Every structure is written in C-alpha cells, then in structure tokens.
C-alpha cells in the first residue's frame, strides 16, 4: 500500500478548507491563529500540479493571505471580515469540489 501525491493533496486541501472555516465559526479571530492553516492550504494547492494555473479557489485563498500579511500577529479579524472570509472559503471549497467533478 502506497498513496500518491495527488490523493494526499486532495485530502489535505479538503481538511484544511474545513478546518479554517470551522475555526472562523468558533470565533477564532487572531491573524496568528488563522493565517498558518491558510498558508498550509495555499502551499498544498501549489503542490497539486493538476490544478489549473488560474484556479478560482487558489486566487481566493491567496487574496486572503495577502490581506493577512498586512496585519500584526495579534490583530484580529472583525465580524465583517469573518463573514466575508467564510463566504470566500466556501466559494473556494465549492470550486475545488467542482474541479474534482
């Protein structure tokens, strides 16, 4: 038994999307508490060579990473930013699932 890179990436991307969304639903707000998982999600999409270069889901995650890069470690996302991030992550997750079909 041996699992390939692609299937490991798919499992990690699905679990990271849901983990980041769940943290946001649990009122986790600090940049240093959300950003590391988001970075892990972005890098795993980057390791998934089968994704199209302009893939929608990666663009949404990247834009959030860029936004978080302007914050201090201790800065917190506000209610509006959390709701928007959840909408963007749901949209990126759905785009990933659509890609798989």
């Amino acid at each position: 038994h041996h699992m390939g890179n692609l299937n490991r990436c798919i499992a990690d991307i699905v679990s990271l999307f849901i983990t980041v969304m769940d943290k946001l639903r649990l009122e986790i707000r600090a940049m240093d508490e959300i950003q590391p998982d988001l970075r892990e999600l972005m890098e795993t999409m980057n390791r998934m060579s089968h994704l199209p270069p302009d893939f929608e889901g990666r663009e949404k995650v990247s834009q959030w990473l860029q936004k978080l890069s302007s914050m201090s470690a201790s800065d917190e996302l506000d209610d509006s930013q959390v709701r928007q991030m959840l909408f963007d992550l749901e949209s990126a997750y759905n785009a990933f699932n659509r890609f798989l079909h």
Side-chain angles (χ1 to χ4, degrees):
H1 163 79
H2 147 88
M3 198 66 25
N5 182 63
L6 169 61
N7 284 322
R8 290 178 198 221
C9 288
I10 293 177
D12 291 351
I13 286 162
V14 170
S15 64
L16 284 159
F17 268 120
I18 302 167
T19 183
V20 178
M21 291 185 272
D22 278 350
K23 287 184 171 175
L24 295 172
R25 287 172 196 129
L26 284 166
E27 288 200 294
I28 300 177
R29 305 284 191 93
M31 189 270 270
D32 62 0
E33 298 178 40
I34 292 293
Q35 192 274 174
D37 289 336
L38 198 68
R39 176 78 189 285
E40 287 309 292
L41 175 57
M42 181 80 184
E43 298 299 340
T44 178
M45 287 190 286
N46 285 343
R47 290 198 305 279
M48 195 176 153
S49 44
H50 296 80
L51 287 174
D54 62 355
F55 173 62
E56 199 193 327
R58 191 163 40 195
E59 175 259 59
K60 289 194 158 64
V61 170
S62 178
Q63 290 299 328
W64 275 104
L65 279 168
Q66 285 181 70
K67 167 77 186 187
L68 288 168
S69 76
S70 71
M71 297 168 66
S72 296
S74 60
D75 289 338
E76 294 165 325
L77 300 164
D78 64 31
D79 284 353
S80 182
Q81 287 169 330
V82 170
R83 184 151 184 180
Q84 184 67 238
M85 194 179 185
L86 278 168
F87 175 58
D88 290 343
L89 285 174
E90 180 178 351
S91 171
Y93 176 74
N94 291 347
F96 188 72
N97 278 318
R98 288 189 305 263
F99 173 80
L100 298 178
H101 298 66

